[PDB]
Amino acid sequence: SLATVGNNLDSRYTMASGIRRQINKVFPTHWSFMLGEIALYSFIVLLLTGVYLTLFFDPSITKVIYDGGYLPLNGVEMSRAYATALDISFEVRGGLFIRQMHHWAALLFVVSMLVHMLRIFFTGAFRRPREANWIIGVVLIILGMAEGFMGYSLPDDLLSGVGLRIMSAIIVGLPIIGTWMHWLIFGGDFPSDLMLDRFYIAHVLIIPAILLGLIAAHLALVWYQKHTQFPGAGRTENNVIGIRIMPLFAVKAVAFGLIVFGFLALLAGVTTINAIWNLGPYNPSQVSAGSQPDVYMLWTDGAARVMPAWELYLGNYTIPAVFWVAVMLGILVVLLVTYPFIERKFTGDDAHHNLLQRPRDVPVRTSLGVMALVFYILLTVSGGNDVYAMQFHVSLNAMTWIGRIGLIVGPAIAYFITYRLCIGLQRSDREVLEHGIETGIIKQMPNGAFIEVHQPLGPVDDHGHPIPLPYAGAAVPKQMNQLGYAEVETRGGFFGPDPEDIRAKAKEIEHANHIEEANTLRALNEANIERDKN
Amino acid sequence: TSTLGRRKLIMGLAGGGAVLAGLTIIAPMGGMIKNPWNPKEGPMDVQGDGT
Amino acid sequence: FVDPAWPEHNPADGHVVTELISKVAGASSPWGDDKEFPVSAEETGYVHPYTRIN
Amino acid sequence: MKSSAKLMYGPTVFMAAMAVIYIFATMHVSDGGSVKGVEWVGSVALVLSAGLTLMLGVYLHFTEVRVDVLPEDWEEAEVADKAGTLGFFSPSSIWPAAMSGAVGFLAFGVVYFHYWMIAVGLMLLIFTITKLNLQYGVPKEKH
Amino acid sequence: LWTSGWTLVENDVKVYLGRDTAAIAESHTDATGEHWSTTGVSRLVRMRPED
Ligand SMILES: CCCCCCCCCCCCCCCC(=O)O[C@H](COC(=O)CCCCCCC[C@@H](C)CCCCCCCCC)COP(=O)(O)O[C@H]1[C@H](O)[C@H](O)[C@@H](O)[C@@H](O)[C@@H]1O
Ligand code: HEM
Ligand code: HEM
Ligand SMILES: CCCCCCCCCCCCCC(=O)O[C@H](COC(=O)CCCCCCCCCCC)COP(=O)(O)O
Ligand SMILES: CCCCCCCCCCCCC
Ligand SMILES: CCCCCCCCCCCCC
Ligand SMILES: CCCCCCCCCCCCC
Ligand SMILES: CCCCCCCCCCCCC
């Protein structure tokens, strides 16, 4: 019944060797090699909750008088887009749940990629040969941000409408062809007909298709290079040490997959997001104090706040002050996209790297990363500096000046501290290899000298003083519990003491197990050595 | 080697759990369900009662 | 029941730890006070990872 | 600590005597530069101030009974008498700094009187205290 | 971008300063269901220099 389904599926696709190859691929097990999955799962939730969300939504700007589930706002003249978005939360059973799931998933998606990009950056996974992946991923994050932006602008409420007003007036104030380009996008003056239609047709099709295509290409390209991994015992630059796809990797992927799905289902219910009923229909005259776009869009708005009034008047023409903002954001994007190329120009090393490197061993790049993180965080904080100012009792003018000055001295201090801390971590790593683990046994010698017991990880010469082990690019133990010298040697339940008979054998078995593991790992190391000398 | 064939209870409950999860995921599709015989809100207009 | 890791002491005219007295001047070692350190590099089960870059 | 357990009786009995003088002298003496009546701050906090010294004194007294003659408590002791192990001192830890940062977060939480900030700061403090204690207990990484 | 609604002043229209009274449509249900009238309702109203 099962032997026969495979028989007549192989007899026609000759897939025995093709499938065996896929199910035997080995993947490195590290918690930081999973952060990419979070983005994938959040993306699946978005496109699935999004499709459900389009069965009840009318993206029209046509004004109507509201009569619906929301008893307030009855009799209020609103757009068709706002009225239907207000209907999918008060007239659709479990529609608010799905709407909130969608928005939460959007947030997680952007944070699922940012953190992933940080992992890629710090560990050096963008090096040869993985630069197409870096470029693809960078395009992915920019498009994700753009997608999120046009998503929350669909309801056409008062808060989102101001975002569109800002965006339109940014475009219109571009040198030379910013007037024609603005009229080409919106189809006329803002607001326009066929403005919520072009955005809705590019948020549920153009961007999704592009994103899906890029993602699929991204994953396939990753599966071709079969990942990267940290330096460790037995692992070289021409092998992958981890677990096979089945039965271990596939199940773990599903398990974590549904974990993310379940977590998004919790926030969708217990936590409110984008309460559009309190915001009212878009009106060009009405505005609110907290008009921040969204967390991933805060950096752009923060850039616009800290840019001084630097207009260039050229007779019959004028360059707005916001033009420089555009220039600056353009530079930040260009710096981010073409990083592998700039890093390898100033390092002069392009040597097909398959082994990762710990952030502590690359202080310049790590420090640049933390420098850039502080830059981004300051822009993000400045983007919502009016809610910071009130809630934390700080002058708003002082906040603007903190943003302005902090963008110069914040990055500088971040670099200095991070560099020093990286070297500090390197130094602590060498003390252990040179002298051994600092055990907490302060013995007094007969003469009266207080001495700390040191545990060597290597062979000693004559009288302690271990032969210094060379750095190996891996994590060195720092405590004695990391060698299992604190392991609980009492099998049983919380109440159950467990029979000694079955308790003796199990400790013996585990002892023989980790002995064999260590033996096989060191044999792998030896193999690499005598392989590398030919 | 997974030793799942021997655990009748684990795989039995796992099946039930997975089915319930699936049904939980697809349940908000019941927001589309509408009773054809429930008259639309408000008094009867010139287009009838909606039924 | 007595834990395996409990120090092998005569339960006569001697107690290893009570409410207020102990055998050391300071905190007891969390890896057994009767454990002799250091040990051979073999017992630690630390495998020095040979790595070559490029 | 043979003499340490004893010298606390000095402050204990002193403060006990002052607390009883204070209560009786404040509730029965009319000076004209004040009013008559027992003072309920210098009384409670001076009775209970003697309590601290008494507590520590008694505890150290009970402890010192069941300790042998230590080399540090012996007048003519050789340096080689304590030759042995002085127990376990933590070589390093990042958690003190973290948990100071956590108390700082809760501090500003209470200052601004933000409920979320107080709640987060409280559970940011539990976490760091827990990690401080479980530092040398973190099991060898099981694959 | 040159023009707004105030440009009507140039071509001999008398524009007032209209204050927004935020008036909404009124429900009027009678024998043929419910309808929102919004007739006789003015959301912009003239304002005086003592107001
Ligand atoms: C793939 C396997 C499929 C298995 C199906 C199991 C899936 C579980 C979840 C199903 C969705 C939720 C089920 C019931 C949800 C529920 O409670 O809805 C009421 C219920 O219906 C009734 O009473 C009569 C009973 C009808 C049966 C309902 C159960 C649905 C099953 C039988 C159909 C699916 C099976 C088909 C296979 C699908 C494959 C695709 C081909 C309608 O009364 P109503 O009064 O109209 O309420 C209106 C508000 O809903 C509304 O928002 C509106 O706003 C209000 O005005 C109000 O009218
Ligand atoms: C749409 C969001 C993204 C998804 C779903 C995604 C997905 C993945 C997945 C599943 C992997 C496999 C390995 C792993 O989990 O770490 C991976 C690897 C990788 N991704 Fe991403 N990624 C995304 C965004 C990015 C971004 C923004 C960048 C770069 C700026 C990037 C660069 C890389 C690189 C270099 C690798 C290789 C890591 C390695 O092979 O060691 N990705 N990605
Ligand atoms: C690609 C990832 C996506 C992101 C980051 C994203 C983001 C968002 C955001 C932030 C909103 C505002 C939701 C709210 O008002 O609470 C939204 C709304 C919406 N999205 Fe998406 N979305 C994505 C994909 C999709 C897809 C693929 C579809 C359709 C196939 C879709 C259809 C919708 C619809 C109909 C709305 C309705 C506006 C509303 O009901 O609020 N989205 N999206
Ligand atoms: C990563 C960058 C983020 C960008 C933010 C830019 C900086 C401006 C921040 C403004 C903060 C406003 C704070 C405030 O006014 O507080 C409150 C308003 O906003 C909030 O409630 C903050 C919620 C933040 C999430 C905390 C969740 C705690 C549960 C943890 C369970 C895991 C007012 O105080 P209250 O709610 O009444 O206690
Ligand atoms: C004893 C002969 C019949 C069983 C041979 C195995 C059938 C082919 C299995 C192919 C598996 C592809 C998924
Ligand atoms: C984008 C240019 C990067 C330049 C980084 C230099 C940081 C300077 C910090 C001061 C270092 C003192 C030793
Ligand atoms: C040492 C000076 C103390 C101040 C005067 C003490 C007054 C004694 C109170 C006795 C009251 C009898 C009830
Ligand atoms: C009417 C006079 C009564 C005085 C009582 C003094 C008591 C003070 C010490 C209280 C300690 C509480 C812990």
Short mmCIF file of N, CA and C and ligand atoms in Angstrom, two decimals, chain D residues 18 21 24-29, ligand 7:
data_model
loop_
_atom_site.label_atom_id
_atom_site.label_comp_id
_atom_site.label_asym_id
_atom_site.label_seq_id
_atom_site.Cartn_x
_atom_site.Cartn_y
_atom_site.Cartn_z
N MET D 18 19.67 53.53 76.71
CA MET D 18 19.33 54.85 76.21
C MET D 18 17.88 54.88 75.73
N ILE D 21 15.68 55.10 78.77
CA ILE D 21 15.81 56.45 79.32
C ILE D 21 14.99 57.41 78.45
N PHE D 24 11.10 57.17 78.92
CA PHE D 24 10.64 57.65 80.21
C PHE D 24 10.90 59.15 80.39
N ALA D 25 11.96 59.66 79.75
CA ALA D 25 12.32 61.06 79.92
C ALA D 25 11.50 61.96 78.99
N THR D 26 10.98 61.40 77.90
CA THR D 26 10.27 62.20 76.91
C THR D 26 8.78 62.29 77.23
N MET D 27 8.26 61.34 78.01
CA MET D 27 6.83 61.28 78.26
C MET D 27 6.46 61.81 79.64
N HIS D 28 7.46 62.25 80.41
CA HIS D 28 7.24 62.65 81.79
C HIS D 28 8.00 63.93 82.16
N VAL D 29 8.68 64.53 81.18
CA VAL D 29 9.41 65.76 81.42
C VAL D 29 8.84 66.87 80.53
C1 LIG F 7 21.23 62.64 80.63
C2 LIG F 7 20.21 63.78 80.49
C3 LIG F 7 18.82 63.17 80.30
C4 LIG F 7 17.71 64.23 80.37
C5 LIG F 7 16.97 64.27 81.72
C6 LIG F 7 16.55 62.89 82.22
C7 LIG F 7 15.19 62.97 82.93
C8 LIG F 7 14.95 61.70 83.77
C9 LIG F 7 13.52 61.19 83.56
C10 LIG F 7 12.97 60.55 84.83
C11 LIG F 7 11.44 60.59 84.80
C12 LIG F 7 10.86 59.69 85.89
C13 LIG F 7 9.59 59.03 85.37
#
